[PDB]
Every structure is written in C-alpha cells, then in structure tokens.
Amino acid sequence: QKKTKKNLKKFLTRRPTLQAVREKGYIKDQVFGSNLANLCQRENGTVPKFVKLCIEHVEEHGLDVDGIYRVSGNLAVIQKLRFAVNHDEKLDLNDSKWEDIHVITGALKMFFRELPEPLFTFNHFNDFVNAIKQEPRQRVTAVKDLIRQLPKPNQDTMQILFRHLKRVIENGEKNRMTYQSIAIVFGPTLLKPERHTVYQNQIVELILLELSTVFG
Amino acid sequence: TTALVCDNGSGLVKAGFAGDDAPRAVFPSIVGRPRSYVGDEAQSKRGILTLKYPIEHGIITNWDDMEKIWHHTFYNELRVAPEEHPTLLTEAPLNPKANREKMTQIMFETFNVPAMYVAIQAVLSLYASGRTTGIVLDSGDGVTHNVPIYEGYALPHAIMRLDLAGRDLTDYLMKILTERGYSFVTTAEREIVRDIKEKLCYVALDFENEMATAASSSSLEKSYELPDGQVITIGNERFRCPETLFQPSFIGMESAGIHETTYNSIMKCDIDIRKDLYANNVMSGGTTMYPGIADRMQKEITALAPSTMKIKIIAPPERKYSVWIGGSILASLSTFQQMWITKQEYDEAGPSIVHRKCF
Numbered sequence: 208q209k210k211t212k213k214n215l216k217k218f219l220t221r222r223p224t225l226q227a228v229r230e231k232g233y234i235k236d237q238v239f240g241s242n243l244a245n246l247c248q249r250e251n252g253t254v255p256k257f258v259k260l261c262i263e264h265v266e267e268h269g270l271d272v273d274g275i276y277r278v279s280g281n282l283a284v285i286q287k288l289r290f291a292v293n294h295d296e297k298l299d300l301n302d303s304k305w306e307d308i309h310v311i312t313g314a315l316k317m318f319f320r321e322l323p324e325p326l327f328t329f330n331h332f333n334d335f336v337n338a339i340k341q342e343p344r345q346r347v348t349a350v351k352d353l354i355r356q357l358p359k360p361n362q363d364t365m366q367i368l369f370r371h372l373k374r375v376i377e378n379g380e381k382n383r384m385t386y387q388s389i390a391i392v393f394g395p396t397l398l399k400p401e402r403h404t405v406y407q408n409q410i411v412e413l414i415l416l417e418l419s420t421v422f423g
Numbered sequence: 424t425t426a427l428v429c430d431n432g433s434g435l436v437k438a439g440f441a442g443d444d445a446p447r448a449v450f451p452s453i454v455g456r457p458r459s460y461v462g463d464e465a466q467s468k469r470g471i472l473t474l475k476y477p478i479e480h481g482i483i484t485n486w487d488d489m490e491k492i493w494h495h496t497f498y499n500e501l502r503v504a505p506e507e508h509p510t511l512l513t514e515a516p517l518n519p520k521a522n523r524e525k526m527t528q529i530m531f532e533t534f535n536v537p538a539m540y541v542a543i544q545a546v547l548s549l550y551a552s553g554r555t556t557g558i559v560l561d562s563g564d565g566v567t568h569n570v571p572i573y574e575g576y577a578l579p580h581a582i583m584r585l586d587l588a589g590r591d592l593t594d595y596l597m598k599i600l601t602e603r604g605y606s607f608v609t610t611a612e613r614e615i616v617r618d619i620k621e622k623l624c625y626v627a628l629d630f631e632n633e634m635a636t637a638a639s640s641s642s643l644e645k646s647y648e649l650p651d652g653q654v655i656t657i658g659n660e661r662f663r664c665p666e667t668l669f670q671p672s673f674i675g676m677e678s679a680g681i682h683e684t685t686y687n688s689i690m691k692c693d694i695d696i697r698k699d700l701y702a703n704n705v706m707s708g709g710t711t712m713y714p715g716i717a718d719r720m721q722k723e724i725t726a727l728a729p730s731t732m733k734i735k736i737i738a739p740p741e742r743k744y745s746v747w748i749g750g751s752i753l754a755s756l757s758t759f760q761q762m763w764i765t766k767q768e769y770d771e772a773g774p775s776i777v778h779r780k781c782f
C-alpha cells in the first residue's frame with residue numbers, strides 16, 4: 208500500500224493531459240457527446256443517423272401518446288440505448304428492450320443535451336437572442352438569415368428536428384402538447400451561452416410557428 | 424481536514440473517511456416511503472413503506488430518494504457534518520451529463536460541502552491495484568463494465584456495458600432451484616437465495632467437464648439451513664448460476680459473455696497498448712468474488728488472444744471494496760489537493776463546472 212500511494216502521488220502531477228492522449232488517437236468520439244459536424248462526416252451525412260431513427264420511430268408509434276417529449280423515460284434504459292447506439296450494433300427501436308416511447312424521446316433530447324456545442328452554435332447565440340428581442344415584424348427574417356449562416360449539419364439537423372416537432376404539435380389534440388410545452392422542453396437544450404431562458408424558449412416557439420418561411 | 428469517500432452502488436453504499444483501509448459504513452441502497460426511511464431501517468418496515476432502488480444499473484434514476492441516501496450517509500452512518508469535509512463520490516462510465524451536474528448541485532446546495540469530486544468507479548479500482556493503465560472488469564449488483572484505461576483516462580469508445588450482474592444471478596438461482604422443489608419468489612425469499620449464492624457458488628474451470636463430474640462427485644452438494652430451521656441442499660446450481668456471466672443465454676440474453684466483452688474491448692483500443700491491457704486485467708466488484716472466476720477468465724481470454732500474448736488477471740482479495748479503497752487513497756494524497764471543486768468555485772460556475780474539473 209505504501210508503494211502504490213507513492214506512485215499515485217507522483218502520477219497525479221505527471222499524468223498526461225486529455226488532449227495529449229487524444230493526439231495519440233487513444234480517445235475517440237462516439238455518437239453521444241461528440242461534435243455534430245464530425246459525427247455527420249463520419250456517417251457521410253448531414254443528419255445524425257440516430258436522430259433520424261428516433262424521429263421515424265416516434266412519428267410511427269408515439270404521435271398519439273399524451274405528454275410526449277414531456278414525460279421522462281427511464282434513465283437506465285436510455286443509458287443502455289446510448290451504448291447500443293455508440294457501438295453501431297444491430298438495433299431496432301421497436302424491440303421490447305427499450306420499454307416505451309419515452310425512452311426514445313428521452314434519448315433524443317439527451318443527444319442534443321450532450322452535444323459539445325449547441326445545435327444553434329455558440330458563436331451565433333448572441334445573434335439569436337438579439338433577433339428575438341427585435342420588433343416582432345422583423346424577427347422571422349432575422350432568425351431565418353442567421354439559420355442560413357449556420358453550417359450544413361446544423362441547418363439540416365435543425366430542419367428535420369423542427370419539422371418533426373411541428374407534426375407533434377399538429378396532433379396536440381391527442382398528445383396535449385403545444386408550442387409552449389415543446390419550447391420549454393427544447394429551449395434550454397438547443398440554445399446555450401458559452402459564458403436568458405425566456406428568450407431561448409421564444410426562439411424555438413417562433414421557428415415552430417413560422418416553420419414554412421424560416422426554412423425556405 | 425479529513426475527506427469523505429462515498430461509493431454509491433446499485434445495491435450497496437460504501438462510505439467512510441479518506442486514509443482508511445476499509446469503508447466505515449456499508450448499508451443497502453434502498454429508500455422506503457409510506458404507502459421516509461432509508462437503508463436497513465427501511466427493510467425492517469417493508470410493509471409500512473414501498474421500497475425503491477434510487478440507483479438502477481449504476482445510474483441514478485430517483486434523485487429525491489438519492490438525496491435521502493446521502494443525508495443518511497452523513498448524519499446517521501458516518502455521523503459527521505457535511506459542511507466540514509471534502510466529499511469524493513463515484514460514478515459509472517459515461518454517466519449522463521445531467522446526472523453529473525445534479526450530483527454536484529445537490530452536494531453543494533443541499534449539503535454545503537467545502538469541496539467535492541467525482542471519479543469513475545473502474546478508475547479507482549485500477550488505482551487501488553497500484554496501476555494507472557489496464558482494463559478493469561467491474562461487476563456489482565446492477566451492472567457490469569469492461570473499462571480499458573490509459574493514464575487514468577477511460578477510453579470511451581471501447582467501454583463495454585452489460586445489464587447482467589449480481590442481482591440477475593440471484594434471480595437465475597431462484598429459477599433453477601425450482602428443479603429441487605424450492606419456490607423462492609418474494610423479496611424476502613430473494614435475500615435468502617443471494618446469501619446462498621454468496622456462500623456456496625463458484626465458477627467452474629471447464630463447465631462441460633464440471634457437468635460430467637457432478638453426478639460422480641462426492642463434494643459438490645452442500646447444505647444450507649433457512650431462517651425457520653429447514654435445511655435445503657444445492658448441487659450443480661453452485662456453478663450453473665455464475666456460468667451465466669460467461670454464457671448470458673442462460674437467462675435469455677443475446678449478449679456475449681464477460682470473457683468476450685473483455686476481448687472485444689481490448690481489440691477496440693490502439694494496437695500500441697493492447698499488450699499492456701492484456702497483462703493488467705483487474706477485477707473489482709462483489710460479483711467478481713466467485714472462487715475460480717480469475718482462473719476461468721485467464722483461460723477464456725488466452726483462448727481468444729493471440730498465442731504470443733502474455734495475459735494476467737489481477738483479482739485482489741479486497742476487490743469487493745476496490746472502488747472505495749481507491750477513492751480513499753486518491754482523496755488522501757497531497758497532490759490531489761488542487762483537483763477538488765471548491766465551494767467558492769461552485770458558487771461562481773454552478774453545477775456544469777464538473778465537466779472541466781472531473782476527468
């Protein structure tokens with residue numbers, strides 16, 4: 208025990224940094240927690256494959272479920288989903304291992320939460336908050352033009368995600384979800400400052416509200 | 424002055440003081456609310472309460488009950504004031520970011536600790552075995568992980584996770600004991616089977632050969648007396664139950680056994696360090712305590728690895744508390760002093776400071 212404490216004592220001060228170990232290629236990014244542009248490149252796409260899987264599964268089995276994207280799924284099952292996705296294993300989101308629809312929506316909300324940079328990017332956060340503070344007659348134009356300045360992975364993933372959430376609200380009579388409850392869910396996760404929450408929820412509401420003109 | 428070390432598992436909480444050779448408190452990780460008590464006091468009143476496991480498969484899934492676990496750990500088990508002790512906690516590999524933030528927020532806002540830190544369970548086991556590079560088989564009550572580590576860094580793309588663990592082995596032993604007319608079903612009956620599993624089960628070196636010897640053997644069958652005085656006997660179920668770890672299809676799983684997930688994890692790492700991983704297989708967790716599991720692993724991995732590779736399984740006798748012992752060593756080092764997340768830092772940054780400081 209004395210020899211191990213001494214070596215640990217010195218190892219702590221001489222341990223290599225995280226970036227040095229990544230320079231060697233020993234630490235590799237997965238699906239969760241990895242840069243969005245790097246993930247889409249490795250998959251030869253502009254939308255993460257797991258994002259497309261969740262949306263297609265929810266639009267086929269969970270569009271009528273009350274309080275979807277608001278009700279939380281089991282965190283342990285989601286963690287099992289993270290490993291199954293991160294290893295590119297044979298995966299069918301309709302299998303009984305994944306329990307219910309809220310595990311799928313919870314894993315989708317987590318994917319955007321775990322992103323190193325927000326979907327709306329760090330360097331455009333100030334512009335988005337300033338665009339939503341403008342006079343209402345000029346907001347939609349300012350939001351659209353900032354979106355057209357984002358990189359292609361962020362543009363494409365934003366459209367597929369928002370068009371999906373639009374159909375969720377359009378079935379609000381069955382699932383009791385509205386523009387406000389959905390924006391409360393995705394507001395803080397899609398827009399973060401590097402370093403307010405009321406303006407972030409307002410940005411997602413506006414995009415969902417004027418979906419047609421914003422992505423024209 | 425002296426720091427606290429707390430290893431919150433899916434079944435057991437191990438907590439104590441940094442610098443000690445063993446945890447001072449080991450109590451079950453259950454919370455009971457009436458139809459609130461925690462730990463052993465909740466099991467005594469299992470009829471008045473509805474018991475819940477706040478940790479599921481190594482992941483916190485009930486933050487209300489988890490906050491009660493820590494309150495009990497501080498004031499009832501260790502009998503200390505949290506505002507006076509730095510607190511080192513443990514977590515599962517690739518723990519969701521929101522969970523790491525909620526743990527940091529609770530420790531500082533609810534318990535007012537002067538400093539805190541969270542380390543990866545498998546990393547603390549590797550440290551306890553005097554190593555900073557190797558692959559760890561961490562198998563507890565709720566989850567099993569194969570975590571290859573380089574210089575204290577868990578390699579995330581190569582971490583293997585299996586839902587099969589100790590509790591699932593107890594459930595399987597309950598099932599195969601119906602072949603002897605025993606009917607263990609309820610929660611109280613499950614604790615009897617887990618005790619039999621801990622006392623009499625072992626891993627066979629050759630499972631098919633061990634099956635041919637079972638009838639001819641004179642020493643396989645053992646006796647166990649239940650609380651009410653009745654005596655039961657167990658035969659080849661002593662090693663058919665832990666055989667699930669190597670052949671998970673015994674419980675209907677499609678996953679590979681822990682010997683293959685170890686090999687699959689090593690092969691996902693860079694070829695420059697596979698030799699160092701093959702030679703530093705460290706085992707930790709209660710589910711790795713079966714007699715013979717080290718020799719069986721040594722045999723199964725050699726059959727998978729190239730014939731030229733040197734393979735060594737490290738199964739210390741204290742590996743049931745390896746995670747806590749490593750945390751006790753780490754939090755007591757002087758060179759660890761500047762790594763804590765101080766209270767003054769948290770009040771400025773908030774919970775999200777955990778991602779930069781704890782790695």
Ligand SMILES: Nc1ncnc2c1ncn2[C@@H]1O[C@H](COP(=O)(O)OP(=O)(O)OP(=O)(O)O)[C@@H](O)[C@H]1O
Pocket residue numbers: 431432433434435436478480481562563564565566567588589590593617620621622708709710711712713743
């Ligand atoms: N001698 C033994 N042989 C076999 N199994 C054992 C032995 N002792 C304890 N166990 C099993 O180990 C489990 C407890 O181990 P441990 O406390 O390390 O798990 P944990 O850390 O709470 O779980 P996790 O790491 O999954 O969160 C119990 O399920 C118990 O049945």
Ligand SMILES: C/C1=C/C(=O)O[C@@H]2C[C@@H](CC[C@H](C)/C=C\CC1)O[C@@](O)([C@@H]1CSC(=O)N1)C2
Pocket residue numbers: 434435450451452453466564589590591593594613614617
């Ligand atoms: C003695 C003991 C051992 C243990 O580790 O037990 C831990 C904690 C326990 C929680 C409920 C139990 C009724 C209360 C105390 C048991 C604690 O659940 C376990 O027994 C689970 C249930 S069956 C099993 O094998 N593991 C693991």
Ligand SMILES: [Mg+2]
Pocket residue numbers: 431432433544563708746
């Ligand atoms: Mg553990």
